[PDB]
Amino acid sequence: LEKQLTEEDGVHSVIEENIKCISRDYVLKQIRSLVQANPEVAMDSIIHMTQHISPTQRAEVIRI
Amino acid sequence: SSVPLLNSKDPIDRIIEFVPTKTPYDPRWMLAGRPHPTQKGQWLSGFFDYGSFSEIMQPWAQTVVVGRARLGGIPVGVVAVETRTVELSIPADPANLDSEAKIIQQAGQVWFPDSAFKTYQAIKDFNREGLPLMVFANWRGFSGGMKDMYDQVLKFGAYIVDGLRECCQPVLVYIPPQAELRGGSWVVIDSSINPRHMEMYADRESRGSVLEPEGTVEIKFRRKDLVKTMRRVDPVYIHLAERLGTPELSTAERKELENKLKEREEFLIPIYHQVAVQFADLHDTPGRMQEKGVISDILDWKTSRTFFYWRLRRLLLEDLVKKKIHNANPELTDGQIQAMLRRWFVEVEGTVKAYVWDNNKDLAEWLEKQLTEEDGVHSVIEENIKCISRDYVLKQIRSLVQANPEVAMDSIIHMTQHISPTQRAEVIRI
Amino acid sequence: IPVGVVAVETRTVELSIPADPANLDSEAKIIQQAGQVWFPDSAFKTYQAIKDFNREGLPLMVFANWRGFSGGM
Amino acid sequence: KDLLQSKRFQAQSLGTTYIYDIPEMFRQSLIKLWESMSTQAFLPSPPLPSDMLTYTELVLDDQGQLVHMNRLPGGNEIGMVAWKMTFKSPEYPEGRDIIVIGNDITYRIGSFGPQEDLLFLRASELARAEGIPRIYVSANSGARIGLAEEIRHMFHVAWVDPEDPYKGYRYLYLTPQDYKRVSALNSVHCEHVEDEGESRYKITDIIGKEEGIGPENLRGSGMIAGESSLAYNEIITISLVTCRAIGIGAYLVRLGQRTIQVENSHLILTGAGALNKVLGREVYTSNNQLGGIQIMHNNGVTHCTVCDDFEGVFTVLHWLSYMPKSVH
Ligand SMILES: CC(=O)SCCNC(=O)CCNC(=O)[C@H](O)C(C)(C)COP(=O)(O)OP(=O)(O)OC[C@H]1O[C@@H](n2cnc3c(N)ncnc32)[C@H](O)[C@@H]1OP(=O)(O)O
Numbered sequence: 001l002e003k004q005l006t007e008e009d010g011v012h013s014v015i016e017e018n019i020k021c022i023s024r025d026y027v028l029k030q031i032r033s034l035v036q037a038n039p040e041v042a043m044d045s046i047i048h049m050t051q052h053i054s055p056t057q058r059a060e061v062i063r064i
Numbered sequence: 065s066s067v068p069l070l071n072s073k074d075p076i077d078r079i080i081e082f083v084p085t086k087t088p089y090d091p092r093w094m095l096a097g098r099p100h101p102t103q104k105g106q107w108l109s110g111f112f113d114y115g116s117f118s119e120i121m122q123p124w125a126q127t128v129v130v131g132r133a134r135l136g137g138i139p140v141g142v143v144a145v146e147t148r149t150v151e152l153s154i155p156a157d158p159a160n161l162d163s164e165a166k167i168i169q170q171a172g173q174v175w176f177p178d179s180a181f182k183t184y185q186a187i188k189d190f191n192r193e194g195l196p197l198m199v200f201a202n203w204r205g206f207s208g209g210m211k212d213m214y215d216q217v218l219k220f221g222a223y224i225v226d227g228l229r230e231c232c233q234p235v236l237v238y239i240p241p242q243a244e245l246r247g248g249s250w251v252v253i254d255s256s257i258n259p260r261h262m263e264m265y266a267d268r269e270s271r272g273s274v275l276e277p278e279g280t281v282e283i284k285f286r287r288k289d290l291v292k293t294m295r296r297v298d299p300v301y302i303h304l305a306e307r308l309g310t311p312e313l314s315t316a317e318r319k320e321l322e323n324k325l326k327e328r329e330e331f332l333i334p335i336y337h338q339v340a341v342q343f344a345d346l347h348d349t350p351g352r353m354q355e356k357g358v359i360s361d362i363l364d365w366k367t368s369r370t371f372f373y374w375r376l377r378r379l380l381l382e383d384l385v386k387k388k389i390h391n392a393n394p395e396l397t398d399g400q401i402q403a404m405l406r407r408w409f410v411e412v413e414g415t416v417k418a419y420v421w422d423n424n425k426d427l428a429e430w431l432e433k434q435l436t437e438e439d440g441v442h443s444v445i446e447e448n449i450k451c452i453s454r455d456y457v458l459k460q461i462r463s464l465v466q467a468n469p470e471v472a473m474d475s476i477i478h479m480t481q482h483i484s485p486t487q488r489a490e491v492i493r494i
Numbered sequence: 495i496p497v498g499v500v501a502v503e504t505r506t507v508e509l510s511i512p513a514d515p516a517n518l519d520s521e522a523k524i525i526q527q528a529g530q531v532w533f534p535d536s537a538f539k540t541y542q543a544i545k546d547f548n549r550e551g552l553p554l555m556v557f558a559n560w561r562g563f564s565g566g567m
Numbered sequence: 568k569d570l571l572q573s574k575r576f577q578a579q580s581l582g583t584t585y586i587y588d589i590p591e592m593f594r595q596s597l598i599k600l601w602e603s604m605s606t607q608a609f610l611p612s613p614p615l616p617s618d619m620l621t622y623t624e625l626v627l628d629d630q631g632q633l634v635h636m637n638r639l640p641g642g643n644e645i646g647m648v649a650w651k652m653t654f655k656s657p658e659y660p661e662g663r664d665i666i667v668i669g670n671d672i673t674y675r676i677g678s679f680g681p682q683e684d685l686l687f688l689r690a691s692e693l694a695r696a697e698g699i700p701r702i703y704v705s706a707n708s709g710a711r712i713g714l715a716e717e718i719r720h721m722f723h724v725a726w727v728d729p730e731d732p733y734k735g736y737r738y739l740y741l742t743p744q745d746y747k748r749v750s751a752l753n754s755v756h757c758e759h760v761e762d763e764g765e766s767r768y769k770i771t772d773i774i775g776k777e778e779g780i781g782p783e784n785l786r787g788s789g790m791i792a793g794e795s796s797l798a799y800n801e802i803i804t805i806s807l808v809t810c811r812a813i814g815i816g817a818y819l820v821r822l823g824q825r826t827i828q829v830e831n832s833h834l835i836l837t838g839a840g841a842l843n844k845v846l847g848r849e850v851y852t853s854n855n856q857l858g859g860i861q862i863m864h865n866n867g868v869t870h871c872t873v874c875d876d877f878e879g880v881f882t883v884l885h886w887l888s889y890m891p892k893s894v895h
Binding site: 274357 | 709710711712713714715718719722723724729732733736739753756770771772773774775781782783784785786788789790792793796797814815817818821822834835836837838840841842844851856857858862863865866867868
């Protein structure tokens with residue numbers, strides 16, 4: 001545990017990456033959970049999330 | 065759920081008949097009442113609905129009284145203070161053949177370790193039941209003798225604060241007539257410990273200060289200040305002092321005048337001491353507390369129920385709508401919520417009616433109409449709450465992704481699966 | 495590693511209760527307190543230490559040699 | 568002298584130090600700590616004393632907010648002084664922060680005013696926002712009391728018998744000549760009466776033009792009491808009793824729950840004189856009988872006893888040696 005928590009710029013702490021993964025998954029689940037329970041805001045959350053994406057992501061948004 | 069309400073048989077527009085006196089009294093006489101002293105029947109009303117007061121922990125720590133009761137059908141927890149002298153009997157332990165049973169004299173209007181502990185327990189229990197708390201405060205302070213400091217009075221004095229700070233229901237402190245709060249008894253039940261819920265009220269025949277008048281005299285009116293006061297009041301002293309200070313009289317005359325002045329200075333002490341005590345008492349009045357802003361209002365005892373009903377009801381109704389607001393946007397603080405409710409009221413009723421806020425009855429009726437009426441006027445306050453909820457949810461979505469753009473492309477797609485074709489056109493075109 | 499410590503005394507101890515000068519007929523007393531028994535003062539002391547060391551943020555090492563609580567009158 | 572070598576003497580006459588010596592003792596105690604623990608760990612080389620402690624005084628601005636001021640000592644206009652101290656200690660070689668709060672026993676002796684209470688509250692709020700310990704050095708004489716001095720100088724008594732004052736008096740009053748020049752300040756409320764053909768203003772409520780002597784000190788005291796009750800549940804709270812503590816000053820100490828008490832001090836709620844007056848005889852001869860170490864140390868209000876203030880500051884640092892720099 002010490003090697004995994006205190007070491008940086010080294011083996012890079014694989015458990016740190018696992019924690020980041022759990023975090024991102026939680027954030028995504030919360031976004032979808034909040035809008036699913038209140039659909040009335042969905043069209044407003046879409047637009048804001050198209051303002052800071054690359055053109056290929058925008059093409060994915062339009063095509064899919 | 066909220067606290068249950070009864071359609072009581074005891075009116076709200078009556079007055080309290082029993083009046084707290086300067087001599088010792090049983091505090092229950094002001095909560096529940098007492099039979100008429102001159103009649104065989106005939107009940108003298110108290111503060112609460114007749115038959116409603118119920119005690120707990122009676123024979124323990126008898127200098128403080130606690131219970132449950134009802135005000136206009138609204139259940140409340142009750143704390144009050146004994147003014148009579150009580151006798152505490154301590155039994156002997158048979159394990160020690162040389163032990164003896166003892167009687168300890170406990171004076172009223174004073175905290176002891178046991179009475180402070182009981183007050184703390186009552187506060188915690190009543191808060192956890194979900195009830196508002198009515199406190200009738202007549203504490204002159206804490207016992208400071210060797211025994212009570214040894215028996216750890218400071219600890220339970222502090223536990224009182226720890227308890228009140230955590231109350232989530234209304235806490236209405238009232239200083240009855242012929243009652244006082246002095247110093248150490250303020251700092252443990254002051255409204256600034258929990259401003260969101262605690263409110264303090266005083267009667268006209270009540271008192272509040274740091275020290276009693278006698279203790280203040282003992283510091284600020286020494287012998288020399290009493291003599292300085294005598295210098296401008298007493299005709300005999302004035303005559304003698306003006307004569308002694310007159311130059312070119314004689315030695316013997318000066319000696320006689322000085323001795324007469326000493327005699328008058330010592331002779332007049334009791335009367336000017338009483339004067340000093342009255343002067344000190346003149347600055348312990350509730351008008352000063354109202355001007356300084358340490359009480360919410362000055363109440364007449366006789367009508368106090370009618371005040372405290374309509375206040376309490378309003379607060380309870382506010383506690384509902386504020387809670388809903390807190391559920392719509394949990395990031396708001398309490399002042400924001402109070403101002404929001406103010407603004408909503410004025411916006412929907414009109415500015416000419418803006419003065420109808422500091423009016424407990426009219427606003428309680430308005431809040432009841434807005435919260436309890438359905439399939440009717442449709443509760444414009446409810447629609448405002450819905451709008452606040454919607455804005456909060458939208459802000460939370462944008463806040464969550466703005467901190468974490470790496471999920472944005474996954475959140476867009478899901479939100480295009482449950483929209484109309486025109487909304488999809490808007491998404492693509494914009 | 496900083497820790498909180500609670501331990502139990504096994505010897506018999508003597509509690510001296512002083513007299514209140516306000517009562518002319520009071521007397522100072524000696525109470526014998528046996529080891530390996532809880533008393534209200536010691537239970538309160540243990541509670542206070544637990545609350546304090548928790549609020550400091552420290553782990554707690556307890557060395558328990560308690561035969562029970564005193565049940566006398 | 569005019570300050571700083573006249574207040575030190577007054578503080579020393581009471582058995583305590585002057586408040587602005589708390590930092591110097593603090594630095595010296597840190598030195599002892601670095602040595603005392605040197606037998607318990609392979610500690611790195613200590614810092615120079617000049618780099619062992621750096622601190623800024625917290626003062627109130629005109630609005631009620633804190634200012635991190637660097638100023639010469641003795642410039643305090645109120646009876647409360649507080650600091651933010653950063654230092655290095657053996658367990659924390661680089662960084663350790665505290666908020667220190669103290670009474671000035673020589674400004675209007677001890678007693679808490681509205682500005683002292685406000686500074687206490689703001690310094691404690693800073694400690695909680697930062698999550699760092701709070702240290703309180705108590706040498707006070709309770710809340711602040713007072714009279715309306717002008718009225719005390721310009722009142723008259725309405726006697727039952729002006730030739731015999733032992734037949735009693737009816738009321739206290741002002742004359743119009745003196746009433747007209749005070750009542751505009753909301754210092755006194757009086758009701759006009761006619762008595763013996765004379766116009767008198769009978770005094771019914773005295774308010775006082777001076778701030779810091781009325782019920783506003785209770786509002787302050789209870790306010791800070793709540794703060795202490797909160798601070799115990801968020802941060803580390805330690806209290807040192809150097810001279811004495813009366814009333815709120817004792818509850819604050821008790822609300823810290825970690826009390827270090829110097830010998831020949833007392834934590835009281837009521838003085839010996841008042842108790843002897845109520846009881847009718849000289850029951851008690853000293854306040855140390857009421858809240859002294861023979862009482863406080865044996866009933867568990869006091870966690871530790873020490874001989875002088877320097878050992879007290881050492882004991883503070885010793886206890887802090889065991890605990891985290893912050894709640895996080
Ligand atoms: C905190 C609460 O909740 S209420 C508790 C309030 N605190 C008190 O009860 C005050 C206690 N009264 C006392 O005076 C204390 O017994 C002691 C220890 C200060 C007495 O010490 P003494 O050596 O007698 O001091 P002394 O009485 O000379 O007071 C010095 C002066 O400061 C003033 N003073 C003293 N104590 C206080 C106080 N607590 N508040 C305001 N002014 C005070 C007095 O006017 C006195 O007048 P002087 O300048 O003519 O002497």
